[PDB]
C-alpha cells in the first residue's frame, strides 16, 4: 500500500511483430493507481509508421491502476515492489491472433513494463491491416482465480468506421512474482480511448479507466 503511491509514473517498452512487420514502441505514462485512472504517451521508435491498426496494441500498455473495493484484495498492487507478469491471447473473429507476454516491476519509484507481442493470420484486406477501426468499446473483464494465478476473460469489440464492429475473444493470466492474497471472482469495467495522435500514429496518447466491482 505504502509502495504504490496515490500518483505513480511508469515506463514501457514493447517489441513486436504483426503479420511480419516488426516494430518497437517506447512510452511513458502516469496515473492514480487507487482511482483506477491512467494516461500514457507512446512513440514508435522502430518500424514506423505501423501498417496495421494501433488499436490491437492499445490494450497492452497496466493493471496496477485499477480501483478496487476495500473488500476485494488488490492482488496486483500487493505484488509490488516485486511486481507481476501476465500473458494474453486475443483471437479475432476473422482469424487474426495476437499473443502478448509482459513483465511488470518497480524500479526507482516507477513501474517498468516490458512487453512482447505477435500478431498473425490477420487478413490482408481485413480491418486491422487496412486500419478500419475506431477504438474499443467499454469492456468488462471477468476475473477469477485459477492455477494459483488471476485469470481474466473478455469479449471485446472494436468499432469499425463503416458503423459495424470487429469482435475478439481475449484471455489473460496475471501472476504475482511473490505470494499475495488472491481475490474471488469479480468484474473489472474498463474504458480505453486514444486521446491524441499525430497523422501517422507514430506518437499516440492513451487514457484508461478501470474499476473493480462484484458480480
Amino acid at each position, epitope marked *: 500500500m505504502a509502495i504504490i503511491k496515490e500518483f505513480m509514473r511508469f515506463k514501457v517498452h514493447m517489441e513486436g511483430s504483426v503479420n511480419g512487420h516488426e516494430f518497437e514502441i517506447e512510452g511513458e505514462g502516469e496515473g492514480r493507481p487507487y482511482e483506477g485512472t491512467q494516461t500514457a504517451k507512446l512513440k514508435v521508435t522502430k518500424g514506423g509508421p505501423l501498417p496495421f491498426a494501433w488499436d490491437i496494441l492499445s490494450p497492452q500498455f497496466s493493471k496496477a491502476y485499477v480501483k478496487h473495493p476495500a473488500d476485494i484484495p488488490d492482488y496486483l498492487k500487493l505484488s509490488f515492489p516485486e511486481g507481476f507478469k501476465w500473458e494474453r491471447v486475443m483471437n479475432f473473429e476473422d482469424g487474426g491472433v495476437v*499473443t502478448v507476454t509482459q513483465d511488470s516491476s518497480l524500479q526507482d519509484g516507477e513501474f517498468i513494463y516490458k512487453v*512482447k507481442l505477435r500478431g498473425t493470420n490477420f487478413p490482408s484486406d481485413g480491418p486491422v491491416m487496412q486500419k478500419k477501426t475506431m477504438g474499443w468499446e467499454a469492456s468488462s473483464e471477468r476475473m477469477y482465480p485459477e492455477d*494459483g494465478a488471476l485469470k481474466g476473460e473478455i469479449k471485446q469489440r472494436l468499432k469499425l468506421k463503416d458503423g459495424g464492429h470487429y469482435d475478439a475473444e481475449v484471455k489473460t493470466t496475471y501472476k504475482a512474482k511473490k505470494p499475495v492474497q488472491l481475490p474471488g471472482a469479480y468484474n473489472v469495467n474498463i474504458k480505453l480511448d486514444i486521446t491524441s495522435h499525430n497523422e501517422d500514429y507514430t506518437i499516440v496518447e492513451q487514457y484508461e479507466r478501470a474499476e473493480g466491482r462484484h458480480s
Partner: nanobody
Amino acid sequence: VQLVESGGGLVQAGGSLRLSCATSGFTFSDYAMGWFRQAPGKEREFVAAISWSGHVTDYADSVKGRFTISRDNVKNTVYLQMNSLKPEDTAVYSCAAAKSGTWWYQRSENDFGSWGQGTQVTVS
C-alpha cells in the same frame, strides 16, 4: 530438474497418441515447456513449445494443425496430443524446460534444459 515422459507407443498412420510429461523439482507454472523429437541417426528437432500461462504456443511447420501442446499448471504436467500421425513422426520424443524464465518463440535446443529420458513413438 525431473521430467518424465509417458504415453508413447506404436500405431498406424492416421492414428493418435497423447504424450504427457510429469514434472518435479521446480515451479512448473513459471517456465515455458518444449517437446522435441529425435529420429534415428538425426539430431533433436523442435516439435512444440508452450509459455508459462499456456496462452502462447509454437509449433514446427511439419506438425502444425496435427499436434496440440497443452499444460496443466495445477497437476504440473505437459501434454502433446498427436493426431493424424504419419510414419515420419517416428522418433523419441523428449520434454524440456526453458532455461530462461522469459521464453518468447525460442525453438533452439540450447534454449531448453533438464531433458527427460524420452518416450518412443512409432508410426506405420
